[PDB]
Structures are given as structure tokens and as C-alpha cells.
Amino acid sequence: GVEAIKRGTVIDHIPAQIGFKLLSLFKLTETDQRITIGLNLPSGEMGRKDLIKIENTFLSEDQVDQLALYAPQATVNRIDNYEVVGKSRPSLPERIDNVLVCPNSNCISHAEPVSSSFAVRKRANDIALKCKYCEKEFSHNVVLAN
Amino acid sequence: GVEAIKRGTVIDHIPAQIGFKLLSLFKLTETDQRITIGLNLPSGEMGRKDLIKIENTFLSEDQVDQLALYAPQATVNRIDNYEVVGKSRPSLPERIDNVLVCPNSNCISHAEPVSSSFAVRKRANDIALKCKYCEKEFSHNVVLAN
Amino acid sequence: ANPLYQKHIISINDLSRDDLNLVLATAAKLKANPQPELLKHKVIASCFFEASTATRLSFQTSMHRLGASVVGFSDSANTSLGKKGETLADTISVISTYVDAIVMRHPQEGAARLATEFSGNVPVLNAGDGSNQHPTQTLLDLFTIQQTEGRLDNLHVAMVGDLKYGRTVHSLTQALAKFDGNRFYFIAPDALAMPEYILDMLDEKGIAWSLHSSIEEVMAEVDILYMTRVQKERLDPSEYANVKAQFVLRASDLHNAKANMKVLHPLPRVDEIATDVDKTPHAWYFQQAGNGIFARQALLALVLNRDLVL
Amino acid sequence: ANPLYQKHIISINDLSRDDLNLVLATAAKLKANPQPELLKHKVIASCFFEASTATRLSFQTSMHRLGASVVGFSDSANTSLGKKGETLADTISVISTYVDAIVMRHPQEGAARLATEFSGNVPVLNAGDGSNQHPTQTLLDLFTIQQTEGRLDNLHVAMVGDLKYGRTVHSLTQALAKFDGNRFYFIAPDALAMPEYILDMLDEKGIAWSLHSSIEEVMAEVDILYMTRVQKERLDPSEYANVKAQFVLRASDLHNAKANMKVLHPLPRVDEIATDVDKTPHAWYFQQAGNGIFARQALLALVLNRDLVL
Amino acid sequence: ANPLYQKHIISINDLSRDDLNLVLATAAKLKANPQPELLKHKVIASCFFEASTATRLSFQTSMHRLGASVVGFSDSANTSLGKKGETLADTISVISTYVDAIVMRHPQEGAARLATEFSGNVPVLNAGDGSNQHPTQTLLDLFTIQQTEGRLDNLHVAMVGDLKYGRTVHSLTQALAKFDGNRFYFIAPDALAMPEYILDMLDEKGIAWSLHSSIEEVMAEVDILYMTRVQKERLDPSEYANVKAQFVLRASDLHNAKANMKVLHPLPRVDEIATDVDKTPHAWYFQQAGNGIFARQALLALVLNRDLVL
Ligand SMILES: O=C(O)C[C@H](NC(=O)CP(=O)(O)O)C(=O)O
Ligand SMILES: O=C(O)C[C@H](NC(=O)CP(=O)(O)O)C(=O)O
Ligand SMILES: O=C(O)C[C@H](NC(=O)CP(=O)(O)O)C(=O)O
Ligand SMILES: [Zn+2]
Ligand SMILES: [Zn+2]
User: Fold this and answer.
1) At a CB cut-off of 8 Å and minimum separation 6, what does D201 contact?
2) Residue C260: is it exposed, middle or buried by C-beta count within 10 angstroms (0-12/13-18/19+)?
3) d(C-alpha D76, C-alpha D48), whole Å
4) Phi and psi for E165 in degrees, rounded to 5?
5) Using a 6 Å CB cutoff, which residues line ligand 1?
6) How far apart are CA A60 and CA A81, in angstroms?
7) Atom nearest to E137 CA in ligand 3
8) What is the domain count for chain E?
9) Helix-helix angle C167-176:C135-149, to 10 degrees
10) Domain A1-93, what fold?
11) Chain C contact for A114, CB < 8 A?
């Protein structure tokens, strides 16, 4: 596509203006081998599409379903020998630990040395996240706002 | 190498791990156009380069010069309908308005609505940066926030 | 081993209908036949990082009626957390090497859950964390409702006041949704309404609830009228319009209440219950406070004793 | 139009040897024979957002000794910036529609420089901006030096005290590095030493400067001993070790001082210049303070009158 | 004697369409050609018991631009009322024996009205009394409106922000209701809405006013968009929900504004007028601030000089 690799992952169908967020959010910059980023690529059905290619790397257990919460229709293509060895589409997990910040000012998660952790319920219109410590439940819009 | 382009700019020869910094710092990604970034891709000349093809956007001299504090030897290139019109290069820019933040905590620039501004001088070895307001002079490395 | 032995009582949410029923059955037994030695030689820490009179003194009287020992604080201004920057994680890590259970009240929501990550083998019992939960308030209110109503199912329960910051009603509603057929009436000013996650749960469960702008609307319908106090200390400045009680209960308004109906309140009360109510047969809030001794004795008895023969 | 006519006076860094010499010549002219109506019908703002006895009152006496009217404030607490959140930018935008020139002292470095961005054609005269510059201090310091040494070129000047935060030695070191063959001796604690950017500037201009650990080791070769006071208002907690004066001058140390050498101090002094020095021939700081009237009068005359005091 | 000669100027409610028109005509006369000695030998008191940058400094520049002398204070903390318990009544009684007229701003509503009870023949000019009136603000607001619209009759004027405590919109709404055929649009949060007594007055005079929930729904028909700032100093705790600006104007909203329409603001502004509006053609608040000098100069001229600036 816009580049090829012997082995690596290719995250395609990334929504626009989110592509650049993933290089920071997964720190795909602490790397030595090549990355190909194509931004605002046409995708006839979804117009704007960003796409990332990482040579020699495959996304870990975390990032794949953490990607579910960030680019719900992205398609992760595992490649080896230039063959699409696996294709994946992320599922929403039961929980997301470490990466999200509790919106509640008075949650102890903000003062003490502990990893944040939220439960993921896929609540009719949107994902609701319940914080493991203060027990409040929030719209994912709120929890992963920018 | 990497993906084709008709009209625009292609910033080649960016030193490794700096291509990212530049996408962010001068906001180059906040566009509705197609950018292709090749991170960590083999150069030869100085081992490994990083590089950005920004399609249908052209830089002024003034923008291009601002890159000299990061990528001094970068090679800007404008291609009007595929052929290379002008291959340019950064010269350090005399002033760097708006991009950096004064590390003096008591500088007035932090409270009021004015844009930041620094005078740039090759200070003998490092590039020194004097804030136009508090007049304190700083090495370019510290001004690039810690 | 009984189901509650060595459990952390952090949230009503983690308890089932039978854990709850086990506590009430035990509280009833110890209310009738006392056990002065049940916890002879256990030392229990009472750590109150936020103001309390009744929760702290009912808890340490319960410990003393069962032969236990108490060490602790009611004011974190003099701990090394207060003056030297000890984290709550290192505070709990150290205190768990000394004692057999930790009773804790703290101002940030989430504090007792955090304590359990550092606690080791020591059970942590939540005397209130910010505006989240107050589990031991619900075991004394459920013992009181059972005492007066002889039923914890099919009741008409009205909850009045600051329902957004009230940890007592967040825990009580979650517990009464475990029994069958309870009808809830929530009367609160908009700003201080029931948080949506409690409502979502009532709905997902098929429980009936409704909102009302007065108490008169529901006075003849209710079995329990649960009054709460505006949590001034938890309010945001934008909520300061809501500091004064919006719904005040006076003896006159008890005009056509069912005879069995009781007025419960976790206390302290400010202006929401006039003192003439105190002299009516409906006022049950100081008998309720008294029941804290049996509900808390029960919980301490069950968390630290494998099998209990009562 | 004379060279300084309507220029902003913000930093010594923007004035030439000639601009300084002009001010000085006009100071001597107006000291010799007055001009009471030179600025008749002008109204000048006195905007002191930071403490001042001498700079504000010598500036306002100069405005009054030339016929101008003064409006202003000495304290920001009752300005709309103090109580209402007005920005310094909107403050200068409104005051620029009223007065003929703006004198302002402010606690942040950079404050007079941004007033100019918003002041229109109204000149901004910097009465001290945080720890950056103080250009009118240097104009009276230079007038007093010229007046007691005859020259401004080929001097030995020692600067003692807090040179990191001393805005007076920032401007003055930059003014004397404009004349030829001046030698610099700097006596400060390491934590309050001269900022790199002034030493660099001394170096590319080829000026000879040196660090010294005592006043005594340079007492015999200096012509100007310019003493400063630790800027305690500006110190960080880290630096609180340096609140007391390390180098304190007593009259005995002057017993081998060059007979022309004078002791200057911008003032206030706290313990660094003992009061017995006050009675000795080398003491010139109150004379120095008085010369503020003539340099400030000259400066206002040049920035606001087209012509040139003959 | 001209009509305003020695009148107290306390509320717009006591001045006629003619009294306002007079002030305005004199403002244009004195803006066109100055009068430096019109108030020579008068001494005017500047008594600011509440914060001020613009009203105090534009008033004192006007007094100075007409030859008068100023005496006063900007802060009450070091007055004998501040430290000794002097009453405002005895304060005005003593100051009336010294000065030719008294300008005073004060935090209580009614303060300038009672100064007149104790000021003898010395006129009292109200520079703002609590949340009641601010008559000289309206005189420069009207001069700026007349100056940018040509008329004061038949305007569309929207007033946005805190209208409950905005003393500026109290006076200004009452001044424009003196001219014919002006339409009013009021955009405020319900808690900071126009006081009943001004709406009544609009109604018996048959004036058309309407409430609107956005600037955008009236942006195309307004000629004057007069923005105000929430009077946070004056808010009750109840009202603290309204401290942030609900209606914030950014330059994009002006992209369908009538080409003559100007944006006025008494100032200080905090978040309600974004700084990008500052560069657009509709922005007229700093021009407006400048016109304070001409209306205040005209007012002093009329109250203190018998004659009439020709
Ligand atoms: O304070 C309240 O209103 C209810 C409740 N009160 C109690 O538990 C009684 P005390 O604060 O005396 O321990 C609480 O949630 O803290
Ligand atoms: O304060 C000092 O030490 C030096 C200097 N002092 C003065 O200008 C005298 P004043 O603060 O009374 O106006 C200053 O920078 O403010
Ligand atoms: O403060 C305001 O918002 C409006 C108005 N502002 C002014 O008059 C400007 P100042 O308070 O600087 O004199 C006032 O009523 O005081
Ligand atoms: Zn949380
Ligand atoms: Zn700066």
C-alpha cells in the first residue's frame, strides 16, 4: 500500500486527526526501524483516513484493545513475508488499566502512587467507564477527552 | 523514496527522531492535506534519516529557517507539478516568534496575552536565545523545555 | 469459615443479599446475647482522616464490648501523613504490620479501596470515603428498617436531601435494590440529584423509582422517610445556592403518614428536621444510631472469627 | 527633533554612547539653569506597581519642576488590575488614551517592554522591571560618576552585593561597557553572581572584568565602589542563605582608598554600608540620590519636547 | 448660569434628555478645542473608596487638563474612616470645607446621595455607588454612541452580562430611554437579570425590550452590542455559579454583524470579549475609554463654571 514490509503491523482505517495521536499514545517513536505514516489518505467510504506502518513490530496485548477505545474501526494487519498473516479488529475489553485519568478531582487515584483502572461497559449509546477507586462511572467522551 | 506527490514541500534529510518533534512544534500535521512521514528510514549519507512530504503546502523562507535549531542541515524542496523547482535549506532565523516559551518564571510573557519572541545568536558553540521581554539569555537546549 | 471472614467491607456493591442478611442475623443475636470476649486479644486500628462522632465512637465502643483493643487517630494533622508527607500507601503498609483489622474514614473517594492494595492480610472496613460509600451505615439502617418493618422487601422508601454527595444513600439504595419489590421516591434539589450510575442500576434491575418535588406528594405512601443533610463540605462553590435545606420536615407534615412509618436520618441533622418531629412516634433517628453498636459488633465479629456459634 | 524624542526608554541595551551623553549634557544644562514651564500642559502617568520612595518621588518632583501634571498610583491593590482582573495590556491601552507619557515600575521582568506594544505613540519610561533593567538609575549613576571622576571612560569600577537580581548593576554595567577602557571588579556570593549574558557581552567587547572575594583586595585600585543590597524580595527559598550581607563596608576599610574614589549605592541600604562611612569624604550616595532629579528632568525633557534644551 | 451649574450629578434618573445633550455638546466643543485654564484655581477632591484605574485616572486627567488641582485618596484603609471610625457623613462634612467639588466612588449603594446631604454647596459627582448608578460612564458611553451611530434615538442596543449588579447598564438603560424609539435586547443569566424597576420604567414609557438567550440571535439587528463583566465583588455565595461568563464574544460571531455596529464594554473585561475581536472593525471599547476624558472634562466645566463653553 503506501509502503510494504517483510514483517510488521499495519494499522489501517484510522480516523482522521487520530493518526498522529497514536504515535505519541503508543510511543511508536522509541524505535530504530522504519515507520511509514500516511495522513489524510482517501478512503472512498470514510473519506479521510490515516494509516500507520511499523516495520518489525507487532502491537502488544494492551495496545490492540486500547486502540479499540481510540479508533474503533481500525484494522490491524499482522504481516510476515509480505503476507497478511493475521487481520484483526479490536474488541472493547472489560477494563483499561494504566492509561486513562479519572475525571473526579477528589478521586484518591490522583494523589497516591497507584495505576488507574476503569471498567468498560458498552452502554447503549457509548462506552461508560467506572473508575476502580471512586466508583463513579463516566462517559468515555469525558474520560478520554482532549 | 516513499509515496509520490505533485505540488507541495518535501522536507528531506531530517535527523533521526527529530522528524516527530517537527510535526508537532510547527504544527505541520494540523491540515486537511496528505502528509507522508518516513521515520527512521535509511539514508546512507549520514546513516539513517527521517522525512516529511507535505502535499500542496509550500513553506516561506522564514518557516524553513526556523527548522535550523532542530534540523540544521535539512533540505527543503518544493515541487511544482512533480519537478524540483527549489531545493532550499535552513539558515538560523534571527527571531523565533511564537513557538518557544520563556523559561524565566517571572517573565511577563507568562501572564499577559502577547506572543513569545526570541532573538537567536550562535553563541560560540550553542545557539543562545534571548527573550525579547525579560531579556534573560538561555541556551537553546533549556528553552526546549525540561 | 463464614462468608465474610477476612473480607474487606469496602462497598455495598461488593456484598450480596446473603452477606447482608448474615450481618443482620448476627446483630440480632449479639443484641440479645452479648459476647464480651469474642475478640479478646485483637488490636484494631481506628484511623479517621475526616471528622466523626458517631461512626468512630460506635465502632470503638463495639470493639470494647467484644474484648478488643483500639489504637488510632481522629485527626490526621498529627500523623506523619499530616506533618511529614507519608503517603496513604506507606501509612497503611506500616499500620498493617501492627493490627488485626483497619477501620478507616477518609475525605477522598477511593481511599479505602487503595488501602486494601497495601493492607496485606489485614481486613480494611470503610467508615466512609468522601461521597462514595458508607457500608456500615447501611448495615445499621437495614437492621433498623427490619426491626420496625419486619420486612426488607416490598417497602416504599423515600430518600430526601443531598443525594449527590450523600454516601449513606448511595450505599443504602444499592442494598435495598437487592431485595424484592422496593419502590424508591427521590426528593432532592436538581443540583444534588441521585448520580446516574445508581439510577442506571435501578433501571437495569427493573426497580421502580420516581422523582418528586415535595414530601407531601409521597407522605401517605411511605414506610421509611430517609432524610439526609446537605454535604456543605463536599459542595463546589457553584453549588453553594444549595447549602440551606430545601425540604424541611416538621411534626405537622406527619399528618397522614401510615402509622408504621419511621423517619430515619444518618445524622448530624441541621435544619431539615425540626425538633418537634423528635417527640412524634415516627422519629426513629436516635434508636437508629443506637443500632450501630449491634450492626458494627456483628461485622467485626464475622470478619475476624472463622466460625461463630451464635 | 532631538534623538530621544518620543523614544521609549526601557533598557540600556537599546541606547548608544551618544544617547547617554546627550541625557547627561541636558542634565548639566537643566541643573545650571531651570526650566519651570518646559512641560506645561502635559499630564504624565506615574504607574508604580512595586514599592518605591526615591524613583517615584524624584520622578514626580522632576515632572513638577518642569510644569507637567502627574496622575497615577503607587500601589496596585486598588487598581482594577488589583481587584477586577484587568490585564496589564488593557490597563496600558486605556491609560494611553489619557496621558502624554507613562512611567511604570513593575515586579515582572518584561513589563515595560510589553507596555510599549499597547501604548500607541505614548512613550513608556521604565522605572524598573523586576530583576531586569532600571535605565533611569544608570542615568543618575553616570551623571554622579562623570561629576566625581571627570570621565566615564577609563575607570576602575567594583560592583559589590547581589548582582544576579540587582537591576541597577545590569543597566550600569551595560552603560559603562559603552565607554572605553573601563575595568570591572565583581564581588558577589556565587549564588548572586553576575548573569552570564552580561559577562559574555563584556568578553566579545574585549572588556576586562574579574571576580574578587573581598572589598579590601580591590580597595586601593577602584575609583567607583558601587555597593548594592541583596534583593530579598526576589530570592528563591534556595537562596535564603544569602539574605544577610556578606560584604559590609565600614569606614576603616576606606583608610587606603584612592582619594578620588567615591562609594555609590542605589539605596535602600540595609547592613552592607555601615553609618560611620556616612561621615567620610568617600561617601557619595546621598549626593547620588539628589542627582536623580537632574537626570530624570533631562530625560523627560528630551522624550517629550521636540527641540533641545539649548 | 448654564443648567447644570453646581448641580450634584448622582443618578441618570435626575437628568433630562436636555441635560445629557448639553454635556455631550460641551464634550464635542472641548474635544475640538481645549481650555487649559478653564478651572484654574479650583481644588477638587478625588475620593475613591473602591477600586479604580480608568474612572479615577480619566477624572484626574480631565481636572488637570482644565487647570484645576486635585487632592484625594484611592484607598480608604489609611483614611480616618479606615482606621479611626470617622463616619462618611463627618468625612464629607470636613472635606466640604476645603474643596470646590467632590468626586467619590464608594462600595455601598446610596453613598453619593448622602454625601450631598452633608456637602453644603460643594457639588458631589458620583463615580459609582455600589451596584446602583455610574452617571459619568453613561455620559462617555452616549458620547461614543452618538459619535459612532450619528443618533441616540432609534437604535438597537443589546446589553449582555451581569445586568443585576452592572451599575453601567442601570444608568445607560435609563439614559437611552430618554430618547425616542430605541429598542432593547437583554442577554443575561436569570440570576443576574435586569432589575424590575428598570423594566417597569421601560414599560410605562412604552419602550420595546426583549430577553434573548444568545448574542447570535440578535447579532444581525443590533447597532450597539454593549458587553459587561460579572460583578464578582458584588455576588452573593448563592450566585457563585455565575462567576464565569456565559456569553463570550469571539470575532467569528461578528461575521454577520451590521457594518455600523460597534462593540462597547465599560471595562475591565475578563473572559467575555476574546482578544481577537480587538483587531476587528467593530471593536470600539478602547476608543470608548478615551472618550471618558471629553465627557468628564465637559461635566466638570459645566458644574463648576457659571458660563457656557461657547
Ligand atoms: O455526615 C452525614 O451527614 C452522614 C454520615 N454521618 C455519620 O456517619 C455520623 P458521624 O459523622 O458523627 O460519624 C457521613 O456520611 O459521614
Ligand atoms: O532597591 C534597590 O536595592 C535598588 C533600587 N532602588 C531604588 O531605585 C530606590 P526606590 O526603590 O526607593 O525607588 C531598585 O532597583 O529599586
Ligand atoms: O467594573 C466594571 O465592570 C465596570 C465599571 N468600570 C469602570 O468604571 C472602569 P474602573 O473601575 O477602572 O474605574 C464600574 O462600574 O466600575
Ligand atoms: Zn476515580
Ligand atoms: Zn522572558
Assistant:
1) D174, D177
2) middle
3) 7
4) -105, -5
5) C 52-56, 128, 134, 137, 167-168, 229, 266-268
6) 20
7) 8
8) 2
9) 50
10) Alpha-Beta Plaits (3.30.70)
11) yes
